[PDB]
Amino acid sequence: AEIYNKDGNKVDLYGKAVGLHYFSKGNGENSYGGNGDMTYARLGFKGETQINSDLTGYGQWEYNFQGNNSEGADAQTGNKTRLAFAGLKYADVGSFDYGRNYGVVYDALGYTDMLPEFGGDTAYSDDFFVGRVGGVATYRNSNFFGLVDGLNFAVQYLGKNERDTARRSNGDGVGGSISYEYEGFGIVGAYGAADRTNLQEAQPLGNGKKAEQWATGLKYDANNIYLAANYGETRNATPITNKFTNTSGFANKTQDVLLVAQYQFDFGLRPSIAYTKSKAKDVEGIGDVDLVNYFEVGATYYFNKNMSTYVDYIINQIDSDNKLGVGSDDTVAVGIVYQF
């Protein structure tokens, strides 16, 4: 909500609480998502200020706190800062920001990530360009300098991050994304390329230095309807873990397909359907395998913008004989949300 809008400065504090639970057969080790209480609250602030008629500056920050944890040593587990960046928006040329923000590729993957709780599984966090990461400098242009309506393009540089684990580390990277919105229809295409650090190469899985991602997205949103289809291909970018070997690394090749179809009703209802799939190829010692292959069937009741309830039933089509130990069981999640 907008709490302070004065002196040519406006602040929108946005925060929410989510009472959530995941049900699954058994203890929940083999469940797609898990099992138990996953309640969480997020807090964040967005701020803008028109320095001039043609120039405004903005800053945004978001944090996530988990309530499922106890008050002991595990209180901080799952607690983090999602977004923390700043930037400036000129009148027409565009806008430039820096900090910890979503990667350009997520823009394409944004179309499918409309599900209540699950969705966007391919868009892993702390990954090169698919998810939200720290150390990015992004420039964005709206309507190509106002020349052509609906054509927004952006570019992003990724500063190297040398962390303890290859899963969370990266290096110098670049990327771009284009989006054309016409008459309700929407099309997008994004590409990102970066260099893997030595720690990443040292991992048993994964081979090569150029970690590459790219994606194409299509959608149509209107008349209380939302259709979306994202097809993405990557090399040495997707993380993979083997329970049998208890060893992790990255995928030599990956194809990902996401499809979403949601209808909305006047009386605060929104049924949703989602298909998903991700196939890894040229895996070291595992040939080709499917990481995720499932259907979604869910719904969301919107009492209002600030209050909502939702359910999601995940029909995991993954087979038990999978050569990586990926969960071959179904799952369900039920959530309630308040947000200001």
Place this chain on the structure above:
Amino acid sequence: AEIYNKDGNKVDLYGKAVGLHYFSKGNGENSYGGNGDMTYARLGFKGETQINSDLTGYGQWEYNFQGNNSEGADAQTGNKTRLAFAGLKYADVGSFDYGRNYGVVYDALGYTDMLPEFGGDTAYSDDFFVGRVGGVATYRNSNFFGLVDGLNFAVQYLGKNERDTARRSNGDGVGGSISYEYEGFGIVGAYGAADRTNLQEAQPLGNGKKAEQWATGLKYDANNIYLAANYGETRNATPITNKFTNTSGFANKTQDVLLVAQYQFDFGLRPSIAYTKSKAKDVEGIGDVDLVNYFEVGATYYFNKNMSTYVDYIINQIDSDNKLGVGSDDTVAVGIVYQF
């Protein structure tokens, strides 16, 4: 304070800062509470929204940050999320919430927990129903559907939590609580029962599976006066630690007695008195013992609702020969509070 009350939605940001210190003889190992600086700040947001005349939705979240810690590796010690839940209140039938919230039994134990800093020692956190825990679904009825004034009853289900330690873990549980308020007087009764996980049974102390708590509370509040008396009995529910053995677990049986008497003055003063006791029975190898047995003598000056000062002197009656290493020393605490 209420910062945003618009569009049929209202937000009350509530946060406070507490400059606190604990004094005790010696280093403070044997002190009841401890010794040193215990300053802490809490931040939280509550939000409501009347979806309809008869239906409103609410969400609440609270976090605690400790200032006593340094800026090094120990910054996060004692930092946590206390409450994080949501729920809906219908006009008359009642209200239903889910998340991380107080257990039904705390309602009874709420009467005694009116002290400035100490108090409610029996109401441990991350315990089955006595303190605030994650994974509860609670329903509450006010005035029994509006039929009888002052009679509020509630019921609570507790989803299982499989954590690393038995102290913070639990299992499927159920509980209920009833409260009758008449002419200022108040009476309450709460009961909770759940199953202990295998990890809990494996502990050296404790025996049995049905972890049971129950409590009865009485009070009278009026004329600037507050009297309260809570008697609670539990089986395989209360945690216990042995310094001599350096081993922990739960109490086969426990009786707890709490008594509070506070007077309030027009000129922002509130002297308080509190008696407390907890006796464990059928302990493995220790027979029957007293965990806590002390008097309180304290006071609180209320400059206003948003600013307060307080003092509490804890006369620990515990003897040194106690067979668990519990502190047999007195203690004192002095605190100053700002809160919006």
Place this chain on the structure above:
Amino acid sequence: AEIYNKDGNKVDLYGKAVGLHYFSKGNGENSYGGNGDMTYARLGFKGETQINSDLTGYGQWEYNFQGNNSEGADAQTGNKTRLAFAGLKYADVGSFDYGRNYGVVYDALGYTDMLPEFGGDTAYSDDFFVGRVGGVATYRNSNFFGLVDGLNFAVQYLGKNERDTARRSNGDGVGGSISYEYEGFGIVGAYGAADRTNLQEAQPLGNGKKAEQWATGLKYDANNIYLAANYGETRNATPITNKFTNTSGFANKTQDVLLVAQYQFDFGLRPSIAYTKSKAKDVEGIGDVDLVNYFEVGATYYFNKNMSTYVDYIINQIDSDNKLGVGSDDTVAVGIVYQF
């Protein structure tokens, strides 16, 4: 920004986001500051309330969240609470506060700490009186009871803190500070003395018990100009680390000199210059050495109070042959800030 100013109570939520980066030759091990992304967001609340015409109470809290970290196990690295205290300001006698706050000596060192990002290196955190620490009780007088204008004096007691490491620990301490502001010119003098804990003495470096700091500060601020010169001397107070030995401790003696000269322009610009030096003496096995010796050359564009950009180039004059492994390389930092 002031969000709630009602019922004789006023709340100023202040928070900011900083997109930052540090550039340096090589990986950045030898760089003065470091290298990579150092983006961070701070959130805090200040609150006041006039209980009476002559009496008001205030509470302040600040926290720092780092965005450079990932969402894995290292999310909390560098996350902390800077300030968390409370206190009361009487009409004329002065004001008294307690909690986690700046030490009296920082007041003198405040003059030089006007740089955009770097500066105030001598004012280490969790140190006795130079930086912000927990467990202080401070009293302050403004204009010596209103008798003499511009003469503010304060006194501070430091409760002992027994932490795991000597770097973050302390003991009982005392200190005082005086500040005379006349016609734009400003003069200050601060002194602090405390006892070192046994853990501190056990360290290989450092000798003696009385950890002593003191400082003298001069400044002139007017006409869009800010000049400042702080000279401080300490015994057994400054921390020091030896990479060659991989051993730390404190400095038997230290002299520190800080000089700042900043000019401001009407068109939102602020060039800055800073000289700095710190020399340790009577070091155990290293004789006399220079910890830091560098120039600053930087600038800051103030789009407005809520939005700013800045740059700082650190000319490290330290030589490579330094007998402690201190970085002998230059550095640069570029930052962008939004703040409400």
Place this chain on the structure above:
Amino acid sequence: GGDGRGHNTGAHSTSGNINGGPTGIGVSGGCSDGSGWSSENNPWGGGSGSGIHWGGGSGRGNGGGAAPVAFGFPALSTPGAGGLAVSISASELSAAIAGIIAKLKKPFGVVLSSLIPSEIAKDDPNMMSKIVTSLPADDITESPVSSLPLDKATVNVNVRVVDDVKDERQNISVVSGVPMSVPVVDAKPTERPGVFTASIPGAPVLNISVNDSTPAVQTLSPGVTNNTDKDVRPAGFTQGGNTRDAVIRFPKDSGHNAVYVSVSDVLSPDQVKQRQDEENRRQQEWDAT
């Protein structure tokens, strides 16, 4: 880092509060008597508590923020950087060891334990672990340690706990039968309450901790056996070649009895064949002389 901005020295205050200062919290409910029947209480109040209760009450539930080894039973202590960790008890030594020492009173000795590196390394692969043993000094020494000059560094003893090499294993055992005498060292206290640091020449820092609270225990480790056969046998010529013992005394205002402690190295099998060899050569000598 620019924190100095502002940060005025002296009393800190803002400017322009909206309302005049209230006297206190005497009127809690509002600008009302608290009564509520007529329109004097809650004549302005609106939407008082429509929401259900959320954590009603203060909520400050609680507050912000060495089992002893029996005397005479050799056990492994892995060292730390701060030295070895040992925790003694007050309870006097069991019938077993008193028995042994009485029998032995009237160089020979009796084997307490036997060592097996194969096993000891399963848990302590580095082979850093030592073997500590402790007796109450008075049961060893004829002249009580109290009634002893502070100048004496070596008190005489009637028995000692010593490493021996017999039947192809190293073993810890109680020796006696000749004039013997061991180091006497004072135990400096430490930060911790009832926790001291004895330092015996040639061992690590032996930080002790008295405890007569926990019931005494006997630790059981796959390497260290408890040889039932307690016959008195002749002892090693090389006895003690990897052992350091000492009577340690506490400061007068502690009330802790003086304690004897031996700390023996765990020999590897090569070093045991070596000790065995030297022992056989010395037996040869003694046999010819």
Place this chain on the structure above:
Amino acid sequence: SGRPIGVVPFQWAAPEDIGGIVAADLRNSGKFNPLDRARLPQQPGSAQEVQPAAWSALGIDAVVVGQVTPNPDGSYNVAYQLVDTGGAPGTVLAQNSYKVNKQWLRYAGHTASDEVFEKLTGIKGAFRTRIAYVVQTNGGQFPYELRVSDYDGYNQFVVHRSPQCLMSPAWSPDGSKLAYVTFESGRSALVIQTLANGAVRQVASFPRHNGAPAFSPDGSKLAFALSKTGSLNLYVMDLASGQIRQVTDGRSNNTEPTWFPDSQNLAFTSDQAGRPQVYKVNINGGAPQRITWEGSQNQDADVSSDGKFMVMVSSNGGQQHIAKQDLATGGVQVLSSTFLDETPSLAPNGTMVIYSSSQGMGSVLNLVSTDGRFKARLPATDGQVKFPAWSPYL
């Protein structure tokens, strides 16, 4: 309904519409129906010009005419004549002429309103009287104002501004002082402020609410409610000595006193019977008697100046409205039909009641004639208006 009457525009654009003010005054009382200006048979500028037959034909037996002329000093002379057009056609029943400064032109109208109303009714006029009330404005520093205006809402001025809750202003019987509740100290206080100089007398600051002031008609006493004993009970202060006596003492609740004409009895609201009802008690002999038995709830009573009736807020079957109860019969007549009808106040002549309602979402006060015949909104204020109080004769 009401007596039909001809009210003629005054002979002069004129600085003020005196005829319109007289018509509006007479109408607000409920007792008169000024002839629609568009249907007047003539607009005589003088009594001589009145043609009685043309007014009697329309059922009008009296006609108000007058003249406004400017004076050399910029002031104005206002004159009125009341011409019989009934049994004494063309005769002037009453008349006057007098000099006022422009800023009293509206007062001039009320003066005429006062006389004709009395001439034709025999009742003293209350059109030159004033009302007091509390406004919660949208200003930040002093959101609470105790204000006074003319009875019809014109000529408003502020008597006191406060950053804290104000309640329940009350006029001294001479119209020179207002008692009221002020919370500027952070809790309740009862004070008397002198309008002429704004001086504030502190009346009571007991530990809890000090409220619902009422001046005795003779001016010697102030009634109010204190809960220091633990609950609201009635107390009276002798204004000469300042001594406080308690009038009610018991577990029943007694508050919102209003004085009877005798300055010895109070009517007030009590929950002794459950839902609020009106009780009567002597300020000396304390034993309250319930006097309201109609409806399901009765509260907020005001005793008439002759003591024959009171007005109050009554709840009958869900509907709360301003009602009038005859004090010697108990007969209740509902007067108002607005929503959230609250805080009525009677004119000293018993002919009009001012009260607050949902009108203007709280920002408007309303007048209703005590015959029930006329209802109107007052001019809208720049805030929320509560606690209206009708001055005594002024």
